[PDB]
Amino acid sequence: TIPHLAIDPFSLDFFDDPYPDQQTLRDAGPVVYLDKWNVYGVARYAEVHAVLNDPTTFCSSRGVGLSDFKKEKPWRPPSLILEADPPAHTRPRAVLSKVLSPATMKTIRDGFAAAADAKVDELLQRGCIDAIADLAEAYPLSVFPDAMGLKQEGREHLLPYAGLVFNAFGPPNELRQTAIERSAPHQAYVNEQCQRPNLAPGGFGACIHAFTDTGEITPDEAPLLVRSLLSAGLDETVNGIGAAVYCLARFPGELQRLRSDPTLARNAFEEAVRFESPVQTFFRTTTREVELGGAVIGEGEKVLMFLGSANRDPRRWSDPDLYDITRKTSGHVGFGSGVHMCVGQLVARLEGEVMLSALARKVAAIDIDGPVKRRFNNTLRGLESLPVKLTPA
Ligand code: HEM
Ligand SMILES: O=C(O)c1ccc(-c2ccccn2)cc1
């Protein structure tokens, strides 16, 4: 009943420009079968949203990558939050929700905004910069490791580890296997920083360990929960900030609207998350035979969701391929949906907002002035290089 397609959503051709193939996947039907990897695929908003919001049928404890943890061993010990289902997911999720809570954002907002303003001031002195290395990468590295409580030495492992984590959700292709081959020093660094004595007082890591007193998590659970904040959040936020700068460079009318009302900075970043979804794909595993979109999927089957495709589905969005900083973005799935919806979303929005605010107030024009290079990852979408000239306001 369901169409079989040979599209490889983990190929370099797909990474380079996924949007035509995503229309083909959406228009083939609500549920497709991807013969290249023997998985089901859903690329329309409706089915992506339905899958994310039924965690009992479409579980996460068998992995959110291609690998089925019932059949293969995970490349690293499973995440206590991402790779767990309710009820095991519930208490670790609550701890991270309180560590990264609305109240916590007040304690870090002033410092995050100051670092964003300072970075833009510094970049304006150079004029011609790389908006990835010098901005989208440099800014999160200047605020988040400190907010975690990490020491200075060894931070060069953070970007490789994040890219490794998201490559490892993919199939065993060259991108994944080469990342795992070089992973040992990054794993060793990350696992060591998760121990309580290595996390500075007042930071996110120390706060996680402090929750072991409440009954929500035990002391032996805290290192892995800290590991979550050294796995997720870096590359996605980098890619989101880079995408926002890319969009403001490509859509100068939107930069002009943002300059005229810098309070649109938060929604300008949210629209960038919808428009160039930093996380493009990941999986669920069926725990039973299930009818989805008129299709019957058997038990123990991997289901690949196309988050970026759902965020550009014309069945759900008006003018989905336009970047609109006043768009009503509520409902996009760039942060997921349901019980696993990004627990770090307040940190990401804070970083994105204060950076776009600094650009809105200090920059008059953003002009691409060099070759734009794409960064390739099995599940992340982002730029490798974005040469731009910043004109001061
Ligand atoms: C633009 C930036 C970000 C994007 C696009 C993003 C995307 C996502 C998505 C789609 C999920 C759902 C995964 C699933 O349903 O299986 C998720 C979960 C998660 N995110 Fe993010 N994220 C971002 C920033 C962050 C930050 C800054 C942090 C940490 C400070 C973080 C930590 C996490 C964690 C721990 C989870 C697992 C939540 C759970 O399983 O309950 N993320 N993220
Ligand atoms: O708990 C962790 O280590 C972890 C949590 C979440 C992610 C993630 C996965 C897919 C999309 C967005 N985020 C990765 C790792």
Ligand SMILES: [Cl-]
């Ligand atoms: Cl690890």
